Amino acid sequence: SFSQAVSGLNAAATNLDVIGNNIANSATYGFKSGTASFADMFAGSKVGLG
Amino acid sequence: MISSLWIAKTGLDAQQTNMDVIANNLANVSTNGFKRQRAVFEDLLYQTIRQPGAQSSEQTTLPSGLQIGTGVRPVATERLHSQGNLSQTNNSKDVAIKGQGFFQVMLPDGTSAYTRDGSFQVDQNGQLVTAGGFQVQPAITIPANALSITIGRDGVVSVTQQGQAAPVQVGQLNLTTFMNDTGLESIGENLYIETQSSGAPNESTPGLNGAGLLYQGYVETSNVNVAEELVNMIQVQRAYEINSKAVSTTDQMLQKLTQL
Amino acid sequence: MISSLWIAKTGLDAQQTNMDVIANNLANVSTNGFKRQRAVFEDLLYQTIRQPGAQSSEQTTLPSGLQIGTGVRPVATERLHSQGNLSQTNNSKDVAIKGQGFFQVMLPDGTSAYTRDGSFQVDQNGQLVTAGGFQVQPAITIPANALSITIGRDGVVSVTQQGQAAPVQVGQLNLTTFMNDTGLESIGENLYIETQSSGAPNESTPGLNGAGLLYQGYVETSNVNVAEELVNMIQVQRAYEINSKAVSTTDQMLQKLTQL
Amino acid sequence: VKVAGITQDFTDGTTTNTGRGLDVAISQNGFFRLVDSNGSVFYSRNGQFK
Amino acid sequence: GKLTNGALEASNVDLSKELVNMIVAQRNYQSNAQTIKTQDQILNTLVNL
Numbered sequence: 001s002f003s004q005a006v007s008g009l010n011a012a013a014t015n016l017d018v019i020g021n022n023i024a025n026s027a028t029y030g031f032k033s034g035t036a037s038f039a040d041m042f043a044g045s046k047v048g049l050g
Numbered sequence: 051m052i053s054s055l056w057i058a059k060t061g062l063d064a065q066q067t068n069m070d071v072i073a074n075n076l077a078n079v080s081t082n083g084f085k086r087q088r089a090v091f092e093d094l095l096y097q098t099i100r101q102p103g104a105q106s107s108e109q110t111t112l113p114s115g116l117q118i119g120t121g122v123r124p125v126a127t128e129r130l131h132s133q134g135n136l137s138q139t140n141n142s143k144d145v146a147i148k149g150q151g152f153f154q155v156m157l158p159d160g161t162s163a164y165t166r167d168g169s170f171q172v173d174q175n176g177q178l179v180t181a182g183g184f185q186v187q188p189a190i191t192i193p194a195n196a197l198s199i200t201i202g203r204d205g206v207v208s209v210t211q212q213g214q215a216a217p218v219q220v221g222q223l224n225l226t227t228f229m230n231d232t233g234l235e236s237i238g239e240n241l242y243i244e245t246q247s248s249g250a251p252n253e254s255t256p257g258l259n260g261a262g263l264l265y266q267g268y269v270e271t272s273n274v275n276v277a278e279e280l281v282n283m284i285q286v287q288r289a290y291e292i293n294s295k296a297v298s299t300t301d302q303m304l305q306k307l308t309q310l
Numbered sequence: 311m312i313s314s315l316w317i318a319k320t321g322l323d324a325q326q327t328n329m330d331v332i333a334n335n336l337a338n339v340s341t342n343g344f345k346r347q348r349a350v351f352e353d354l355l356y357q358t359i360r361q362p363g364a365q366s367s368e369q370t371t372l373p374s375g376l377q378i379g380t381g382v383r384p385v386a387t388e389r390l391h392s393q394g395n396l397s398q399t400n401n402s403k404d405v406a407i408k409g410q411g412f413f414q415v416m417l418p419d420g421t422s423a424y425t426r427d428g429s430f431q432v433d434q435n436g437q438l439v440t441a442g443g444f445q446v447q448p449a450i451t452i453p454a455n456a457l458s459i460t461i462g463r464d465g466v467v468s469v470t471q472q473g474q475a476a477p478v479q480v481g482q483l484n485l486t487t488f489m490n491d492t493g494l495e496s497i498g499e500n501l502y503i504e505t506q507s508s509g510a511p512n513e514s515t516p517g518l519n520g521a522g523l524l525y526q527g528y529v530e531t532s533n534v535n536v537a538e539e540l541v542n543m544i545q546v547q548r549a550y551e552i553n554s555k556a557v558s559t560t561d562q563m564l565q566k567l568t569q570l
Numbered sequence: 571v572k573v574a575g576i577t578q579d580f581t582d583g584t585t586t587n588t589g590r591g592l593d594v595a596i597s598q599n600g601f602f603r604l605v606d607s608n609g610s611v612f613y614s615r616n617g618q619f620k
Numbered sequence: 621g622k623l624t625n626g627a628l629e630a631s632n633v634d635l636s637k638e639l640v641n642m643i644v645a646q647r648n649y650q651s652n653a654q655t656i657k658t659q660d661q662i663l664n665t666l667v668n669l
Contacts, residue, residue: 003135003271010138037618043133043148046576050135204607257608284660291667329662333655338571339648401579431577441574457598499574536651543658550662558669583632585624595629598621617628 007050011038053118054300060121061293064091067124069286076279083134083167083240084272087127094120131231134273136265142199143170143178146270149262151225154187154253155180155241162187163241164226164234164251169269178207182239190221201266205256226251227261312564313380318556320381324351325550327384332546336539343427343500344532345389352385391491394533396525402459404429406530409522411485411514414447415440415501422447423501424486424494424511429529442499450481463523464516485521486511592619 018036025031041049068089075086102115136146145168147153152164165180173179178190190207192199198210205223228234233247244251256264328349335346362375396406405428407413412424425440433439438450450467452459457470465483488494489509494502504511514521585595594617601613 001277003137007138041136043136281656284656288660288663288667295667329659333659336651336655339651341571400581536648539651540654543655547658547662551665554666554669561669579632581632583630585627585629587626588628589626591626593626593628595624595627596621597624600621615629 004048004050007041011036052300052304053120055297057119057121058293058297058300060094060123062290062297064122064124065286065290065293069283069290071127072279072282072286075274076276079272079274079276081167081240081272082169082269083165084274085129085131085166086272086274087129089124089127091122092125093122096120129232129234129236130273132273134270136268137271138267139269140267142266143172144168144267144269145170145201145223146265146268147225147256147262148265149260150231151227151254151256151261152242152251153180153223154226154251155184156187156189157184157241161243163237163243164228165240165242166270167240184241186223188221188223190223192220201264203257203263203265205264222255223264224253224255225261226253227259312560313378314560315557317379317381318553318560320354320383321553322550322557324382324384325546325553327387329543329546329550331387332539332543335534336536339532339534339536341427341500341532342429343394343425343530344534345391345426346532346534347387348390349384349387351382353379354381354383356380388492389494389496390533392533394530396528397531398527399529400527402526403431404527404529405461405483406525406528407485407516407522408525409520410491411487411516411521412502413440413483414486415444416447417444421503423497423503425501427500427530428524444499444501446483448481448484450483453480461524461526463525465524482515483524484513485516486513487519487521488512593617594619 015036015038018034022033043049068091071087071089078084096117096119099116099118100112102117103111103113104115106112133148136148147166147168152166153168155163155165157163163184167180169181170178170186171181172192173183173185176191176193177185178192179185192209193211195212196209197212199207200210200217201207201223205225207220207223208217209220210217228244228251229249230247233245233249234242235245235248236242252259254261256262331347331349338344356377356379358375358377360372360376362372362377364372364375366372393409396408407426407428412426413428415423415425417423423444427440430438430440430446432452433443433445436451436453437445438452439445453469453471455472457472460468460470460477461483462468465485466479467481467483468477468479470477488504488511490507493505493507493509495505496502512519516523580599582597585597596615601615604612604614606612
């Protein structure tokens with residue numbers, strides 16, 4: 001049952017990478033801030049999959 | 051040469067087959083798109099010395115007769131076509147389907163097989179083949195100088211090209227759904243061949259007529275529950291030991307019979 | 311064939327039942343409103359070779375005759391209706407009962423069952439039902455456009471309507487009590503029914519005639535002490551192994567006897 | 571023990587002023603109504619709009 | 621409900637409750653595994669005999 005934990009780790013790492021890119025790209029004049037967006041998944045029913 | 055000996059032999063064989071299917075499930079726990087199997091056991095015929103409900107007298111009938119079993123045999127190993135967990139791989143040509151359906155694959159000898167493991171690649175002619183050299187049935191061809199390959203929610207695979215500023219619709223990727231998915235006869239290399247028990251396939255676009263949905267960059271892992279196989283192995287080992295004890299008891303009984 | 315063997319077999323069976331009830335208690339350790347079980351045994355009959363207190367002579371009496379036991383039997387398996395710890399879920403559709411009493415439930419067939427766990431939901435038609443589609447006997451119906459549902463210590467229920475800023479009453483939750491709570495016949499899906507062993511149920515508003523109060527937002531955990539289960543399991547294993555050793559000793563004696 | 575089905579807690583979450591213009595939140599019960607390609611109708615509560 | 625523009629809703633998931641529930645679940649799982657082990661051990665002891 002590691003799939004959900006692995007997906008959560010990947011999502012958190014992606015969010016941290018986005019934040020690091022945003023903070024690094026400061027003082028870049030032609031730059032627009034980025035924001036991550038997650039979504040829950042459900043294959044069958046009664047159980048989540050990450 | 052006694053009935054109990056043959057009965058115990060059948061019991062041992064049933065336990066051995068159960069252990070074999072457990073070991074096979076554990077072996078390919080990390081095979082993409084793998085489906086586990088479970089074995090169902092059935093008893094053999096019954097030797098009737100006194101028929102139940104026989105007219106033992108003019109008015110009295112035996113409530114229960116004398117019947118002796120003859121063992122147990124395995125009747126089938128059914129596959130559990132459930133939905134596996136989806137994973138992330140971030141690859142252009144790794145497709146995972148959610149729901150029901152099968153990709154069609156053209157075998158070299160001219161027949162067609164069906165697969166659930168979606169992890170494709172390109173051969174030297176641009177054909178969209180699977181891992182193993184087998185090519186898909188609709189025969190999607192990827193042109194050279196391609197920049198990126200995009201697969202939508204439905205099976206419309208498109209390619210972004212350098213000097214067009216707009217993707218070109220390379221082709222369509224449908225899939226076929228069977229109404230007896232447990233009935234498909236499996237062969238090696240994650241392929242199934244249509245058989246009599248399984249119905250006739252009817253190809254359709256994903257997302258319609260009960261078909262699944264395609265996701266790019268995902269892979270479907272095997273639906274093998276590791277935490278239950280340990281308990282199953284414990285149970286199987288105990289049953290095997292019990293039946294071996296039965297064989298030993300029968301042998302000692304027979305030896306005491308023949309020592310006089 | 312030997313009385314010792316049958317006595318040891320009965321002992322093994324008793325230990326097996328004890329282990330089974332221990333496992334049952336541990337399995338549903340997280341079930342809401344579950345009452346742990348406890349098994350009580352008793353000795354079987356006694357064969358009187360020499361009657362105690364017999365008139366041995368004209369003035370002498372045997373202080374204690376010759377009596378042989380013949381095993382142990384589980385006389386009963388009873389619930390222990392203690393009060394489980396109250397949790398805090400902060401939900402508006404789960405009520406914990408403090409003290410004694412049960413919620414009444416209308417079974418699909420037409421009879422009445424009784425439950426201790428209060429965690430309610432609403433059906434598609436607006437009726438307040440327990441988890442499993444069983445509605446409450448007084449038939450409490452939640453209207454649509456309901457902002458909040460409030461339940462006091464008593465059984466009165468109120469719903470805050472969208473307008474008029476004035477709550478209205480839509481029913482009451484009475485509790486039923488029994489003379490003998492341990493006599494209730496337990497069935498599946500966390501339910502009890504009345505039998506002859508228990509007394510005739512009597513309805514009562516909460517807080518009257520010794521009936522417990524109602525708390526909204528709390529749920530009642532099972533009164534299973536996981537600490538005692540481990541030591542009971544150790545004792546059960548030891549006793550089972552000792553009885554097995556007794557069986558082995560009796561078999562050794564028989565085998566030595568048959569070698570003449 | 572048999573699992574008697576999972577349930578989803580529909581307590582209202584904490585609204586955060588993200589900004590933007592194509593984003594909305596609901597303070598009480600209610601669901602946005604969406605449609606798919608097949609014509610099926612779904613209901614959601616995510617405010618992200620584009 | 622009343623719409624509020626320029627805002628988004630959180631997940632109403634509390635880490636503090638989840639971690640303690642995880643600890644309790646792990647302890648219960650270990651207890652059930654111990655029961656399985658005990659039953660298997662007594663069965664083996666019976667088998668040897």
